[PDB]
Design a protein around this ligand. Structure first.
Ligand SMILES: *[C@H](NCCCSC)c1c(COP(=O)(O)O)cnc(C)c1O
Ligand SMILES: *[C@H](NCCCSC)c1c(COP(=O)(O)O)cnc(C)c1O
Lengths: 524, 518
């Protein structure tokens, strides 16, 4: 019978024609503050860091400015109250962190390009799939054949069943076809995978994730099944389709890390066998006698959805390579995932495997609103829509007006912490997630109750049985239902999770655990 | 100017002195530029909101999911968001409250980008709705599911991006592909029946659109829409309410009056829609929908036009009669049908919060009605809501910014804001023409009646950079590179007062490009 506290009352905020006087205004803002303050100090169920504080002190002075980073980060524009100099410094930091080639240089196809997002990673995943759709479908690139094969400009998208819902939305928005939709449409009877529940060759809706003790993915780690991916990708690559793969680096519910290096090692030979490392691409034509114009491109695009994990994984991997220097050996290996991942081929030399990465600033770093980064390389940049106006190609971003306050937030954050400090943040979170799992299993033994605790090795989240609605509301626990046998509603379990972000300390977890021990749903 | 060296972020971090010196540099730059900005449609003054709202910066606010549903992320401002949406719903004569059971009630949400997101969402929502994809509440023509998009040549570049992103085909692309020799318009320069790339805007003294007002040519739109409607296509029309360069207002009521008879003739008001087919032997489940969608891009103008129209309706009561008439554009626009019923003509509206109101970052509103909401992709999912929003995580600070703003000003104060801007825009245009006579030079001043922007000849790069003047080149004869002209404009936003304009004009009068004459 615990109290989450009162929610905000709509009548306090109704905006009348005549305006509100200063007393009613302050009362309403105080109510918002008291609400937000209580909720932020108890939030443990979402992958969003809640303590910034130094940031507010450093950056409140900028609130009077209508800052607008309209246009490309690397180009001057007319709207002078912008922070593009700060944006570039942040992008440069992450470029180095993710082993991209810097500085950005439009003359160097291998150098990075990216920009800070005005939404969260939803914007970065949309941009990634937009950029990949056009690149793989043969639209024109920024400056510096597909003969016969009718599938050459029909890209197929692959991602695991732990992929965030934003991807399904982005696929629908951009008209990108998933392997499931193309399989059902064109190849209805040819699914190369056997369903482990039914035994039938039915196209799964997403690439299977790895099984747990059950034999099915519901209690698995949440990592993509690399074997199954390879079977699916080979099938579609053999038919002549170009290939888009999204890999999750810190999945939404289980905090899993898809094994990016293993995926790439497994797929590269498939891409080489089916002519997808280098292929000539017809992009339109100009009318005379012979029609098409042609350039050379890769026929695959691997994107890393690092909304969460691109913020901490580089730091964990720093510790893994020098465990003595940082005083910490991480328990789990996190796979190589970034722009430095290169593999040798049979006959194209070393291939740099990853094409893009997104990250959310409001997840690991923390911010007062959604923000983040999309990064790729110059060689992937698409030519924007033409016009009789001139002056570079400033609009090569998803947003038009762009948030120039977000650069400040993340610049301020990154300036305050060294690499060593960032390693300690991921260390403390990893150790606290392990602690939480230990305490939950001890609770089961102390009380004689089932909590179903689960933690993927290397994840900063632990899942367990959903407690009462009031406890869930007090601590902002994110919920997920799973069916333990797909398509059977009698096997439903309700889970919550806790994300151990850097603002979650031992005291917080202990306070949650103590209420959990007396919760009426948990006690049963 | 800001030196990159001062902002580089080393592996080791920056100490407190270095951090502060960098933030001081940013503040000194921004402050100087914000105080002189007059060339973009962005209100620069909101120091009241800084004092009110700085306190919330410690919170990672997230309005994940639908604004009208609870969710698990408790640090959210959805109650505030709804209050802001309700204000604009009333202002735009939408039906409130939002109610999923009332198809005519509004639905909208606050954007995490600017109007780019709202225009993208509108075109996504219209593409799915017009192409027959499944709705939330629904309890032989081969072109029936091929919508065609129409908008003027003054349409913001965000639309061209949105069209590309969503795979929506414009009338130009469909014309070229399917109907290459059948363009119903003649080009005024060539005399050939060439498909124009966008719907013509109205001509100026030149006989061409470059010196026109920037409003869509209603005749031409009607001709083009008729053509594609006759062939069975459903129709999307974007109308600009405060165009980007000229600040023009497309005559939404005139458009609607002109198009409705076309929609009724070709069965687009009530069209049978094949949205799928059942598990039993292939027969369709069918819904009745309209086959047209009119969206108002009010990025700028949806924030002031309701207040100008208030004064127009009661000019004695507000002590002001606006010199130009702004068209009825909103969800209250209803026309009589052939059968003496009524039809509500507008489907959606976008507005930017960082334009007329002002904000520290991009934000805004998308609003439509319950009857147009699309069914999301099917999956047993985690919490936000059965949502239908573009953004995933959503900015929950922007509701506070706009709520704070709206609570400070009555309708009468809002009317005064748009009055002062209209009168100052007229003043600027007078001063520029006086300056041409005083100095004996051509400034090409132009102002669309009713617009809060004035265009003129581009001055020196130094002056442009000091006052953040937005620039645009025009070809005075399309395709001929030798007829290029360089314009700037000034946007008279509420933060632009007479003193600011007089300081600008005094510098313009001594500017070497302006004095350097033809
Ligand atoms: C984010 N999921 C949880 C969002 C709320 S807690 C901050 C997420 C996204 C979408 O990112 P936003 O647009 O930033 O919500 C995309 N991919 C993954 C793996 C995510 O966790
Ligand atoms: C905004 N155009 C001018 C640049 C912004 S100065 C504040 C604009 C858009 C796109 O809106 P944002 O995404 O908010 O830039 C769309 N339509 C029109 C008519 C606009 O003026």
């Amino acid at each position: 019978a615990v109290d989450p506290g009162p929610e905000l009352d709509g009548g306090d905020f109704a905006l009348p024609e005549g305006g509100l006087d200063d007393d009613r205004r302050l009362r309403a803002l105080d109510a918002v503050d008291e609400y937000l303050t209580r909720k932020r100090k108890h939030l443990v169920g979402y992958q969003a860091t809640q303590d910034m504080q130094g940031t507010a002190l450093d950056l409140a002075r900028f609130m009077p400015n209508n800052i607008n980073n309209l246009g490309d980060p690397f180009q001057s524009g007319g709207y002078k109250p912008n922070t593009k100099v700060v944006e570039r410094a942040v992008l440069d930091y992450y470029a180095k962190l993710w082993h991209a080639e810097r500085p950005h240089d439009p003359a160097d196809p291998e150098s990075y390009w990216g920009y800070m997002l005005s939404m969260g990673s939803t914007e970065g995943n949309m941009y990634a799939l937009w950029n990949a759709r056009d690149y793989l479908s043969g639209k024109a690139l920024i400056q510096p054949p597909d003969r016969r094969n009718p599938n050459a400009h029909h890209p197929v998208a692959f991602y695991s069943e732990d992929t965030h819902y934003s991807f399904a939305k982005a696929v629908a928005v951009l008209g990108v076809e998933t392997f499931h939709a193309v399989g059902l449409e064109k190849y209805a009877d040819e699914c190369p995978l056997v369903d482990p529940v039914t035994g039938l060759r039915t196209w799964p809706t997403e690439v299977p994730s790895r099984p747990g003790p059950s034999g099915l993915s519901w209690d698995g780690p949440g990592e993509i099944d690399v074997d199954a991916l390879a079977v699916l990708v080979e099938f579609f690559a053999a038919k002549g389709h170009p290939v888009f793969v999204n890999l999750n680096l810190g999945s939404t519910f289980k905090g899993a890390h898809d094994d990016v290096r293993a995926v790439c090692e497994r797929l590269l030979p498939i891409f080489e066998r089916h002519g997808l490392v280098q292929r000539e691409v017809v992009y339109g034509s100009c009318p005379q006698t012979g029609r098409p114009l042609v350039d050379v491109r890769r026929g695959f695009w691997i994107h890393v959805d690092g909304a969460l994990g691109a913020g901490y994984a580089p730091f964990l991997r720093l510790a893994a390579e020098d465990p003595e220097g940082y005083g910490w050996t991480p328990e789990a290996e996190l796979p190589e995932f970034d722009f430095g991942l290169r593999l040798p081929t049979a006959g194209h030399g070393e291939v740099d495997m990853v094409s893009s990465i997104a990250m959310s600033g409001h997840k690991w770093a923390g911010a007062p609103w959604p923000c983040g980064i999309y990064m790729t390389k110059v060689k992937y940049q698409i030519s924007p829509p033409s016009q009789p106006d001139y002056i570079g190609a400033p609009d090569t971003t998803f947003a038009g007006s762009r948030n120039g306050f977000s650069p400040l937030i993340l610049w301020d954050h990154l300036s305050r912490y060294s690499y060593r400090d960032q390693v300690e943040r991921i260390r403390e979170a990893q150790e606290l997630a392990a602690y939480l799992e230990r305490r939950l299993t001890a609770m089961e033994r102390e009380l004689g109750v089932e909590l179903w605790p689960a933690r993927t090795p290397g994840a900063v989240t632990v899942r367990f049985r959903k407690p009462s609605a009031e406890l869930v509301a007090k601590w902002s626990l994110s919920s997920q239902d799973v069916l333990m046998v797909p398509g059977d509603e009698t096997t439903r379990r309700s889970y919550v999770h806790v994300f151990v972000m850097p603002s979650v300390d031992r005291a917080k977890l202990d306070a949650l655990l103590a209420e959990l021990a007396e919760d009426p749903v948990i006690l049963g």
